[model samples]
Target chain A: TFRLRNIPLLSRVGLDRADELRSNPEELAKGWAEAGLITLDVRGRVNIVDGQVVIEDAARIGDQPPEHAVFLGRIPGGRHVWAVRADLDEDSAPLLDLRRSGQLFDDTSAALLATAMAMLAWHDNAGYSPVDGSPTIPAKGGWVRVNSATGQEEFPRTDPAIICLVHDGGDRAVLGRQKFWPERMFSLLAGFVEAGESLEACVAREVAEEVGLTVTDVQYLGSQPWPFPRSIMLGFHAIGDPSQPFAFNDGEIAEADWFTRAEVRSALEASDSRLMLPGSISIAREIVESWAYA
Target chain B: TFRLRNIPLLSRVGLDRADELRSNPEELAKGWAEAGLITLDVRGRVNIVDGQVVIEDAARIGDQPPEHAVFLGRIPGGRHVWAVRADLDEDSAPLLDLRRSGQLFDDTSAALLATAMAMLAWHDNAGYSPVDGSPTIPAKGGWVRVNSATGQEEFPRTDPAIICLVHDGGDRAVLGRQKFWPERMFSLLAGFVEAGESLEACVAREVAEEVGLTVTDVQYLGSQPWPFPRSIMLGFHAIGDPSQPFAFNDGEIAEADWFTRAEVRSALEAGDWTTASDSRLMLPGSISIAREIVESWAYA
Candidate 1:
């Protein structure tokens, strides 16, 4: 067995909004299939085919929609996937409301819900007229699209600012794998940056207000382009001082516990425990795994 | 000789208000004698030597009634002094209005005015009936202090959050100075923190918005008890980072510039600039000085 940290890490992967394919799901399916994207089962595990992406989860063959699917992997020679739902064209509220009740899992689903939450929050705070507000909704094709196999386009596109807070004994860095929502698998804690606040300031304040932890050492990690509705995720790493003990604010967080890389891997394998992971098609999982190896 | 950063430094000490002493000269004279405050006309430098304060830069005792006479300092040798003016009454426009119009100076006047400005800003943003939107004016003296030489009945008390900022800055080991002001020489910049923002955040935001500079290392310096119409001076030190450039937002800053310590000293000596020093007496010097000092390093 080799250390994951020792392996070459793909930090920046160019995933454009795929706007050209958003309107035409059939063309998207054909193009993605030709490009060799990987698709995952209901469970988030990706099937490795000669270490290459065989199926693309964010893409599919016919017009059949999925209830929900997790993005597993989309790397070359890796199982390419994006979590989506079948029959999504019939009603969009099931996906939206499912998140409120939690119940959504899979990395792609989580990333998509995160994009939705961020958009909803944006809609709530915007005061001016509808015309001037940001985040113009999609005009056609159920906002999101999936092939007949119901893969891909579970959520909107957004710029995500993510910070991984890592800690191991006294040697601590702001990088780690911590679960966001389990009770509601569909729920994600993604919100837009408020007015008069910077992204760094927002991340720090959110961590403190939501989890009651003081964070220092903010470093820029990388970014990702999520086209659920068009948000670019800016990643960051923030280290909390180990000397100061912290607890969650109770109202926002039900429970928060530290997990070692071993513990995270164990949880992922033990599906019966109801422990959920981000969709494989999401950058959140990649972020978590990157820190997990360290 | 220290290597001077070739920046334009202005004279720090400016002139004083007209009604500071003359508005109620007889009353001031009575207060001075009864309060055992010694009045000294040391040439053109009028100094008041009392058991509590020793005020500097005093002219001859004038007959004009000062709008307000702000209490200043108590130094060694039982010397106490005040910044008295001979114009404007409590009935006229607010004491801060008088100073913004460039009619006040001296430690006592400046302190009172600074404190009053801070309090009024708080009043404008907070207090009063939010439901009915009724305005609350200072009754005679005001909220905290009353029955004094300035005809101010109340002195506004310092908020706990501001006190915490001051104490925290001092505890964290930051360097800077703190000063006070009277109602007569209040400044425009002093205000309270708003909801949904931390004390430090407010300070940094205010400094940047008022003056044009992004301060990186912010240290809460200290605070002072300023009882004019009622207010306290919360001091802070903002260290400028060289990497960040500054641009001022319009409507807040009339004029902003940088000054070295030596230049500040020279300005004070020449009586050509204003500062907000002397926590005991209200003055316009050192408050202006604080902004200038921070700007000098950041802007340069």
Candidate 2:
């Protein structure tokens, strides 16, 4: 089915609007517990804490303090919000492979699943709520948080401009050799913009500094308004000389190499390839598909 | 007369095929100092004592040490470069205006023509260059005593992106208010992106913090390579909300307001405007046609 396009969504809403919505306190307190929208027992209820998704055989939820998760913004049109990972889970993906390798699910479903996975990953990292130090209780029933600044019932704002980028080896897109998080453990490289640089400069510098390839051109593709509690993804298509020397840049990539587009497609089909593709909801899928077709 | 674009010209020359055309030192030096591309002394000579633009009525060129004159990067085309202002005449506009207003004349043209104007203005303010304490001296047919860093002849470089912004008020565009010089001085604002802020965030914050206003929607029109040595100009479109209260926060914007497009057009026609529409050879011209752009598509 064709997804709705141009429904007036904003992915990366300007900061002013974000601040405006944030100020209204009444809008901050809502969501579904199972969906990871809100937390329930701050003290102790589950083995996994906060936004991190835990896996024993299935996706076990929650963990205790210091592992307590911070509340991310709500999911669009869904009951759950989001949380960050409290700790890195070294042995969870093999179990998750069952869900990810399903032939029945379309690419979009995989993208949504990836969003959930990434959010779970974030929970593993962000188990503590910094502001109050109090363990957050994910609201079981659907509830709405009031905006803090304005004390109004905050409507779920959808910013269409935010886009998240992903690249995988299955689609002939290779990961740089240097991985910031150890390739054996965590597998994500992310950062926000710092002052004194332009967006173009930011992306160019990020790719160069991260992967050791100078980005010659950047094509701003699209964006998504992911509200696992704030923070929009700024996505782009970075073009570089295909034959340029590639390096792992020491800390960011463990190894970097090009995989033929067919190799990756076969891996996805076989469900045995060590390499993993991003969820269909991710912008990476579009890039992968584009490359596969090309 | 229309100017031919450079990419095609470079294609015409065999020089475009070389893999390391940019790496050759001598070729790079010549490319760096090639007149009309971007040069070190392109803004003409100026006397800057301590990071200030000097306002002088008349002064001898090359009379003092040349170390204090800080050398910024080259402009594209290599014809000229820019230096800070010094102890020279300050009519708000450069010597071009001084000449236009019949305030001064060229006893000797420096690099191009207004080299003395740039140098005079440099000497009028800072009195010394920020790089070193050497005073600027413009004598005879050429400049004297060039330091390597400040020397454009040996090491040639250019800022690829530098475009001046103008807000047309019908006849002429209004310039930002400045402190060091007189009223109606047009100066460029330079800044970089900050962490935790998006591009829109940086621009909006700069606008609000510098000039008080709740900037709603901003438009990205275009970009230019300044190469005033090595900088770029990322142009944007932001509109002021007149319905909201106007307040200029201290230390940023003393005062800010809107000017009608018709009024700016008149200023351009009458020449009553304060700043020059053209700087060096680059000008925004109708590239944006911003006034018409905003009126046509924004509210509509």
Candidate 3:
């Protein structure tokens, strides 16, 4: 629990993407006989009980049909782990998505489900080719898609976006909220990467476009996969002048304000609902928490 | 030239996205009168004469017709620049792709053509939507594609790949070659980022799969936009064991052998046949981040 603050939550895993097994049909077939199955129901929720995702033996569900399961590589115990989608009904309410059950699961379970959710969402989106309008099929254990007509290959597409923590280099930081977000929720400023820009360039552009502040000395924090649909969030910390006022030129931001370190530290332990941050599983929460105490 | 090796080549531009101007019809129309027009041949070649890419005034080619041009942002001279595709006959050999003429252009031209090449290539590749196979048209100054039916927007596609300089943490580094490359042309080992993997994880997988050496201490060096059909190349430096014998388990590498610091330095000092290669090896050009990554290790 203490080390969770050091690095990202989803990245603290011992799971390896034994990539060779993804293409080896015999190995995948053998892995199932001696494997662990992480099952998700049709609503994209996993069964969690007593603060852990239920990782049962693959033999329990034995048949994954054709493309229902993806080979999630080998874990620390040298056993393969597979993620399968099925019509699971766990009776009453003991299920949660990755975000709601993020901290409850162990380190290994976090990585397993992150990989599972991202891969499944891609299969749902990449059903046809953007090139020829031909139908595409899952190949190599859901790692790639093959065009039916021209036999071309398409891999999963991930959009790279920048999220920044613009601090005054002292006692304050800027936070904004989207209009459609939860009530009183304010986190870091973020936007998607446009064409013909580097990560630093995107960071600069988004910061200026959203907040109207000219930031400098943009530095990298870390990167994480946030598969709400499929996005890779690159985190950064930049220097800006807090004396400037907040401006939402594009209306992407509903409201913004500067928070002192005292206010943020107090909100972390507050009993009231005056302000709410991002969920624990999100990279936004990680970046904000890292900055709150520093 | 000194700062060229520090940052990436395509990243050194004074250009701005100026996104607000994209949706402004009056601004787009006004930018056309006082703008700089960058024309591209239908065959995807830029006209370079005496090492400078030709950037003409927008009034020279007033009409982009329907959607043949994209509004690249403002430059250092307080003037807007647009990239357009049309038919042209240079009737000569004064043409180069971004790779062939990477170092020949100034810093601004290199960045301009890179963004130009990347955006235009996406328009060429994305004529139909993957959602419903619906015909898509360029909108929002060609930065986005409308579904024509659903009105869903699609931005340009850029693939991210990892290219690393696997070294012995000393004076020797490993280099590999594909069978189809020019003779003796061996640069770095690279591969695309797979689904559900980090950039560091992709680096480890590609280095291990292409060559049978376990690498550690992976570190990020730089990232550049390689518009050879739109790829964003991320560079790295890692520590590996050069003493072990090379193994091509996947056959992605035809042959791989290590070169010393002196060997690499000698190759860089050569002044013929792309300006920096000898009979021993022909490394990649400046257009690719491979050359810059190798140079940093060689002269350090």
Candidate 4:
């Protein structure tokens, strides 16, 4: 039910990722002349003006180069987009939190900003090699890091999580609320996919663990790039038993309940109701919408 | 077309992996008393005899403790299955490669052995903590590695990959062969799902990169546990344009071709042709999803 075009962050501008040109320093130097950099502060906040990603000239940020600069491929009209980490002070352009402001930007800016944020987050945590305790330095256009001792290249890490819409054969669906979330707000159940388990398995396991219910007819819905510190959300829809009573896991889910289609529609339509759903930009909202209408 | 039961390696023996019991040393001590360990050599070869996983008593392998011992869940009968890493000489038992000889074993053994191999491989590479670059020690029944400096727990890593059966509107389906494989041996195209991409996006991108073709109607088929190292294979079926000419990636793929149903059936049946299909094409033994999908299409 969710098309790629409906997701603002998924619409990618034509970027020629000349991967073969990354290793050659001479080629990168030539490409740098036409490259434009998008700057992010230490807190992973980006500069946005009038709901547009503010692109800065690569030569103007500072005399000292950026701590990390990832070449985020070239746009169709021979323009390269690079994401750089800079020590911008409070006086800089209006800084926007990606999670709060991502929906405001257009497709191209949202896509590029998401890529930049994910790469910078990886660099922040991956300061040292996991194989050995050696310090690593960024290499190959920030796509990889090289261990100073062994010269081994380490790629970025992105954890995969499964988020699902659990529904019964009747006209009702289930949603859960965590203790930390805003009061009266509930969303779909989700958990990280464990090693040695399939996507289908993860959905079933997570649903049972969180809500104490069994799910069947598990099917893939879609996926979204959720880069709030690096996670790829794999969305699914599953069927559960409506007759089963609800038993929430301790400390994980504060409350969970079944909602009829009319109830969900009313909650979504209400602006100040006790029941609040996720925003329109999220895959959770998309799944809820699909089921609400279906 | 593949059911969870049809895949032998996926059958799980019920075990109460009471994760809360992991941190309690008293419960661990009690559990370790009745635990039986499955051993894997440095090369990940397990001792198998008469088509069963050879499990040894926990106390007999060595007076010293193992380098890594993971608490696999208890079997249905309430016997604990623990996978351990040990140094066993060649004379101990017949070593068998899990990928080659996995089908010989029953469902539970295959499932447990696959789980053990994946855990051991993680321990082999993760010698240091990624967070602080400090030395780490295995903890929580080998399910986590605790940093010696900061006491942070690092979990195991698993990469997700997409393997698809790309077919055209016509009767032909595409399979690619790598240069390192045996001659005439071809299988489905596969690649790791990249960061900031969906499984559907991965399937589309991998197919486009490996072979110059556009595909549509992508749908999930099933999943398989592939622990050659650490990876979970997500199987899918995609429709490709048969009219588009084939163009194989020079480095990744050696050759790719579209095979008619008859050609695939003949190759599957032939015994001596270098281009002969994967043996045990019927079921159970042919662990690869490509063969399973192809068989379904052939017999449909």
TM-scores for chain B, listed for all candidates: 0.36, 0.39, 0.91, 0.87
TM-score, ranked from best to worst = 4, 3, 2, 1
Worst 10 residues of 1 chain A by lDDT: A1-10
**Candidate 2: tens digits of C-alpha lDDT, residues B1-300:** 011121110011110111122123354334333322111233333333232223331113233313333222233233322233344444533433222221122211212223333333323322222233233333211222233335422111111221122233122222344354444432322233322233454455565544555654444433322222233334444445555554555344444445555534443343332445542211112222222232232221
Off by over 4 Å in 2: A1-172, A177-190, A226-230, A268-274, A278-281, B1-300
lDDT of 3 at B134: 84
DockQ order, best first, reads: 4, 3, 2, 1
Better of 2 and 4 by lDDT: 4
Clashes of each: 150, 185, 0, 0
Q: Once superposed on the true structure, which residue ranges of model 1 sit more than 4 Å away at CA?
A: A1-160, A166-191, A227-230, A268-276, B1-300
> TM-score for each prediction?
0.29, 0.34, 0.87, 0.88
Better of 2 and 4 by TM-score: 4
* lDDT (10s digit) by residue, model 1, range B164-249: 11112111211221223223232224444322222344455565544444544443333333323233333445455433443545
Q: On residues A123-158, what C-alpha lDDT tens digit does candidate 1 reach at each position?
A: 222212111112222222234323222232222223
Q: Arrange candidates, best lDDT first.
A: 3, 4, 1, 2
Scored by lDDT, the top model is 3
Give iRMSD, candidate 3: 2.0
